[PDB]
Design a binder for this molecule. Sequence first.
Ligand SMILES: Nc1nc2c(ncn2[C@@H]2O[C@H](COP(=O)(O)OP(=O)(O)OP(O)(O)=S)[C@@H](O)[C@H]2O)c(=O)[nH]1
Ligand SMILES: [Mg+2]
Lengths: 453, 341
Amino acid sequence: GKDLEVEKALKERMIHSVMPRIIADDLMKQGDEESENSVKIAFRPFKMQQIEEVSILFADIVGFTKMSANKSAHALVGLLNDLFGRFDRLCEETKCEKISTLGDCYYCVAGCPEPRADHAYCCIEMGLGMIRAIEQFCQEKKEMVNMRVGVHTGTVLCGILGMRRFKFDVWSNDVNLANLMEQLGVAGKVHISEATAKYLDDRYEMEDGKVTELKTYLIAGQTKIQSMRDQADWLLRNIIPYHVAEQLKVSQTYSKNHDSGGVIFASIVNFSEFYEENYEGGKECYRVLNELIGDFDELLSKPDYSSIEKIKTIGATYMAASGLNATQCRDGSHPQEHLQILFEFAKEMMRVVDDFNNNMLWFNFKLRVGFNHGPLTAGVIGTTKLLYDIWGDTVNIASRMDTTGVECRIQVSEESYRVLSKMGYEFDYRGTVNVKGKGQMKTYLYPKCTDSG
Amino acid sequence: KQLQKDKQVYRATHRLLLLGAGESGKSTIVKQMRILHVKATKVQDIKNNLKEAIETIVAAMSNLVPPVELANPENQFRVDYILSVMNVPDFDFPPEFYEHAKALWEDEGVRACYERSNEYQLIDCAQYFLDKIDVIKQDDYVPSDQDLLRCRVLTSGIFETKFQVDKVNFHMFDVGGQRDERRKWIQCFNDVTAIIFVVASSSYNMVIREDNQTNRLQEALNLFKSIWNNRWLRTISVILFLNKQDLLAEKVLAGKSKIEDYFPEFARYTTPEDATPEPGEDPRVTRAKYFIRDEFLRISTASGDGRHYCYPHFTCAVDTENIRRVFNDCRDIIQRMHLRQ
Ligand SMILES: Nc1nc2c(ncn2[C@@H]2O[C@H](COP(=O)(O)OP(=O)(O)OP(O)(O)=S)[C@@H](O)[C@H]2O)c(=O)[nH]1
Ligand SMILES: [Mg+2]
């Protein structure tokens, strides 16, 4: 009947929760129906604009785990949604497009779709506002967490890559640069670059903040419906998985501890040296990358990978997890057998890139996979801005496993080695890795010395 | 929006990606096309060609299975002089250097050195430019188009060059071909119309500048097999070329090289009846060029499943009329191909 417009309102909310307002309304002229043919062959289709003169702003909670130590696995999502809701309020106040929340990290761009000339002002002013907001949360809930902020300006190419859990995002050498400069930013004060000071116009309390170890600075102040219900159901199963799609029907928010659960970060090692930006922004390198990520999103659609969830893809990194469909024990099944199938995913996706290396002539991709398992907390972030994501200790431990990983080999965590060892796989002891946040850690790579030795 | 007509004039463009290994003639052929359809550094890189050529000659004189000896060793100092300028990034190109290069180019031990140009890497426009630049020992001459087409400058990255042909747009992509460049190709595999795959047929008895241990033509065949099945190019026709015809002809009629010594399946190879050679064309050379055509067409036989067709031609990129004829035929074929969508 008329309810079709209701379902179209839902689908419009879904779009507006994965892509900026601008391109959300742009995709609401439905002239080119090639995405409509994505809903329903050589190169997968994707759209990526190479936009110059945009700012990037990252911000990580400082001392996050020290706060998330003993929350109720639900109050954590509560306070975190409060924080990012203040942050979104500030985004609209400051006219700057947020992009996503990488676990603890939160980041935005200053007008990539709709350019601006004051974008540096907009960006770092939002940074200062974020400092204010986290300071007020610090003395409102009484939590000892401030957040380090980093800003870098330049050119970024913004678009969508992937088929499963695709989200408007940004990529460059400048994005990664803002990332590291936040990583080198001392808490509470925005850590900016030469590239944004070169037109900051000194209207702020310029403070040349060296690293304690490219001329970075520091600042601190101064009928026909069935198609439509199909499309909306697909976009929703995109943005959030099935079980949460059920639980959210009846509940305002969502949150769930998972005492056992595995997570893998598959990062392509030698992308940034395959990506030569001399061409038209080199967005064709990102086209090849999207063609790759397509093969992992394809892997997801196998039968036996039902329980696997691609949480998101962070640039070249690919972040997957399991142990989320597991809601009841079965008599003839083993509990932690899911860690096998997820692990097999890892192996398979390794194999996948070798297929992509057959179609990649006189160059090879090399992805390192980091594997961990343990406790974690899954949650859903916003209202009218839906964003499924998981935190905990497995997330960061596996990310720092991968980031300390070796390519073409699966770096596994210790207790994961213990559990997997009985399941037939033969690991080889790597030694000891100094994991930021855990000190020395014992690690086991998967292939039994696949190289010579 | 002013973008509708822009997209529709895009859809009316023939994308001609130039592929194929290095020193094959992609840059030469695109220079040819722009000559047929369309500021002083050129003379300088021609002189760089001369210098690099003569240096490669004089250097390899010591590192063959016999060390090549000058028939007039009284010019030995000259050789030493040439070995002294071996790597001088800046150069004035003095007249005494040119006289040195010529006086060496006259010796016949130097000649026997050059004739063995297959056992070491060497540029293909050496013997030409030596003779042709002996004339331009002066300063106030600009070289003709023939000299500009035999100019050997290295290709490093996608060079997008446009041109029009009687109210048909054309946008081709000259590309490098050395091993270090072959990662750059897969950028421009997007909606490309035809893949002019250049090959150096006279490079069957030489080795590549990658490792001096792979037969240039065996390497070209491996690369053709690699891009023939390239899962992004299982729908795009490969308008094969077989460039460097005249060099091939001179090599075969020279009688010094043995293709059967380099490739065993030539002794038991027969001339095919579909031969369409021009009058006064040696049956041995014709059998050879068609043998190479068959070695390239076998790659396009065992696979493909009739989604993409290889349309081999023959060409000499430094023969403007040859490119004119073969590109008219190419224009027919890509008219039939681009519209296939
Ligand atoms: N005799 C003859 N020589 C040719 C012909 N085509 C190319 N050459 C010669 O071969 C050499 C290599 O040509 P070149 O222009 O460098 O190809 P390329 O595509 O640029 O090679 P690269 O840049 O990928 S390494 C040049 O010296 C050129 O003179 C031809 O048809 N006949
Ligand atoms: Mg070239």
